[PDB]
């Protein structure tokens, strides 16, 4: 393999890395008060919320790999967009989104479709999504280890993992009973805000960063619904069983 060629390639790589590091530094110093952060000559770290010590750092001779590739691809896509053709006829030399406001009236859509903030914020909220997924996995593991004698809850992740959010479908999954499928919680986790979960009622909810007791409450009430359904399975005791009457 050519040696000077890959040397020149790595040189271009470190040059663009220095450029993007300067850009992220200028962004962190010129940004508003959205979040505090730590900027050093070569090491950067932010804190959008407690227990978020994002360890991104510019190294030089003087997850662990995916997030940096993502950042590089997003910044180079940003530059590429800064360079689609404007399809100019008289002299637009812009983007079709600008001229779309003429025929199609956009009160705030055109403002949102023009340009937005990115760079450090997008990587930060991606790490937020990551830590949210980690907390969800930890809650599931804690339920499995603790509520073992309890009905073993069973989860399944989605497949189209977007740039910011994802989802998981979870169910009670009583021991050897497919007819006990009385509640199915779909959780769409995102770093933008709290996760919104719906089981069977459209009850849009929002937990906290360390709030997980809603899972146990759903577990209990679904255990109740399950004993109701299996009683419907074997006499015919009617549906007079409610959730909680005045609190025992």
């Amino acid at each position: 393999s050519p040696h000077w060629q890959t040397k020149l390639e790595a040189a271009q790589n470190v040059l663009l890395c220095k450029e993007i590091f300067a850009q992220l530094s200028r962004e962190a110093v010129q940004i508003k008060s959205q979040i505090p952060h730590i900027v050093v000559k070569n090491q950067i770290i932010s804190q959008p919320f407690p227990s978020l010590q994002l360890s991104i750092s510019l190294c030089h001779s003087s997850d662990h790999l995916y997030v940096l590739e993502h950042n590089l691809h997003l910044l180079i896509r940003e530059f590429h967009k800064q360079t689609v053709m404007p399809h100019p006829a008289s002299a637009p030399f812009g983007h079709k989104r600008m001229r779309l406001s003429g025929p199609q009236a956009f009160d705030k859509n055109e403002i949102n479709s023009i340009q937005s903030t990115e760079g450090l914020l997008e990587k930060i909220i991606k790490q937020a999504k990551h830590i949210f997924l980690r907390s969800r996995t930890a809650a599931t593991i804690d339920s499995l280890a603790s509520r073992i004698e309890d009905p073993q809850i069973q989860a399944h992740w989605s497949n189209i993992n977007d740039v910011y959010e994802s989802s998981v479908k979870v169910l009670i999954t009583s021991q050897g009973y497919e007819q006990i499928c009385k509640s199915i919680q779909l959780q769409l986790n995102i770093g933008v805000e709290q996760v919104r979960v719906v089981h069977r009622d459209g009850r849009v909810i929002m937990l906290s960063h360390q709030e997980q007791e809603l899972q146990d409450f759903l577990l209990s009430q679904m255990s109740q619904h399950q004993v109701h359904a299996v009683q419907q399975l074997a006499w015919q005791v009617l549906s007079f069983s409610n959730h909680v009457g005045l609190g025992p």
Partner: protein
């Protein structure tokens, strides 16, 4: 504290200076709180002011300017921001926002408590006609 390194980096000098002045004003605010109330917490990058006595309302400082904004793991944007802007501009009107945040936690706790059960909250009945018994 009180770092006096020999030109390791001018950035390090800015860190030392801003960290010192920020810890100074943060201890000042902590003393103000202790003058009003009777327990708070402190950390290295910023400090924490408690609002509940059993985890939100965390204060922090701009490491490159004044106007030390605040942010909580809560809600109410464009209003908390205005409160912090008025705080940075005045530094006097601080306890009314403390009581506002007290009311805020009081209402958010019950809202989140009643969210899972079938309920519909609201500000007021909006019917003050029979304004005798209530």
């Amino acid at each position: 504290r009180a770092m006096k390194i020999d030109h390791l980096s001018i950035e390090k000098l800015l860190i030392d200076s801003v960290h010192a002045r920020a810890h100074q004003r943060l201890q000042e605010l902590k003393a103000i709180l202790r003058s009003f109330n009777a327990s708070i917490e402190t950390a290295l990058p910023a400090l924490i002011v408690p609002i509940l006595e059993p985890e939100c309302l965390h204060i922090f400082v701009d490491l490159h300017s004044g106007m030390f904004q605040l942010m909580l793991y809560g809600l109410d944007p464009a209003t908390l921001e205005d409160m912090e802007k008025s705080l940075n501009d005045d530094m006097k009107r601080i306890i009314p926002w403390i009581q506002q945040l007290k009311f805020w936690l009081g209402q958010q706790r019950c809202k989140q408590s009643i969210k899972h059960l079938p309920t519909i909250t609201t500000e007021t009945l909006q019917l003050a006609n029979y304004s005798t018994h209530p």
